[PDB]
């Protein structure tokens, strides 16, 4: 079982990153004090496993092994190690269905890490990248830009990675920029996910 | 068969730690923005409260934003909003938990300012947020110069005195109409707003409006801690 130590060393490698995170979180708390703002509070998190995909050919959903008896709620965010995966759309008592962010009925408010541009990112089917709202011609948004949740829908906590801009194209005829972004989370062959609750 | 059981615990541990590290990029930028706002040159008797723009009012005819503070937080109509670099605008409509803010580059926004160099006082009006501010037409014999720094005069009873507003960007004599046309570039960024400070001024209950000299000295004091 080489997998035991492969996991152990990947965990060891996270330490310098985790220490750096600690410093950022402490500084953030100091800054929010000085500016009279309430401190950030950690989310509560719960590991969940994908049982199956919904074999609906027109919707991209998976079933997870947690439900109302575990406190799952409609609209609750779901993430993986690499980023946002989706949200809970239907809760049974032991299981729940999660709509994936690349589903065409899924839309998420996001922000560009680099320069704070805010825009909705909508799914277009999990065969394609996410589609941002059309932006003005002179918008400074770049392939490679990291898109994180803005929280402005009151649904997702602000700051989790969603996607990396993959395409920025000017439509000279119609005078706007067309932007697509590729999710950072793997959205195929899912196993373990995290449900998040904001603190109360 | 605890060996496999241990590796599921390890993978779960790794999932949780990775989910923590996902926040790193956000904290880097967030701490940066908050540290900038901390540079705001406030006076001792002045209170501040950070607030977040939670959207821009979709209107091609008005440059307004919505912020995440309201009457519950002590926000009042006509209250200034600032960045560390300049006046951003003022609260025009207060709800319970949110408020609407008029940016100083909106055509319906004007505020009285004072030239730092020589104490000249004049109204600076917005001309739409694609353009610089417009000073009101002045006599041809006005010594205002490109590069002059404009700060709040407080003459409207709205804005604490001596805070940066703009830098004069164009001075042009229209010899036919016989006045000086002057534009000024706001010193605060007015695009892609995120964090701002709501500002409460010090109480001056019966006090007379500040003299040009007092405003100049307050302005220089603010600029010394920048
Ligand atoms: Cl949201
Ligand atoms: Cl005023």
Numbering used by the authors:
A (entry chain A): 74 to 273
B (entry chain B): 71 to 296
Please share text taken word for word from the publication where this structure appeared:
Here, we determined the crystal structure of the major periplasmic part of MreC from Escherichia coli at 2.1 Å resolution. The coiled‐coil domain is essential for dimer formation, and the two monomers are prone to relative motion that is related to the small interface of β‐barrel domains. In addition, MreC forms an antiparallel filament‐like structure along the coiled‐coil direction, which is different from the helical array structure in Pseudomonas aeruginosa. Our structure deepens our understanding of polymer formation of MreC.
MreC is a scaffold protein required for cell shape determination through interactions with proteins related to cell wall synthesis. The periplasmic part of MreC contains a coiled‐coil domain and two six‐stranded barrel domains.
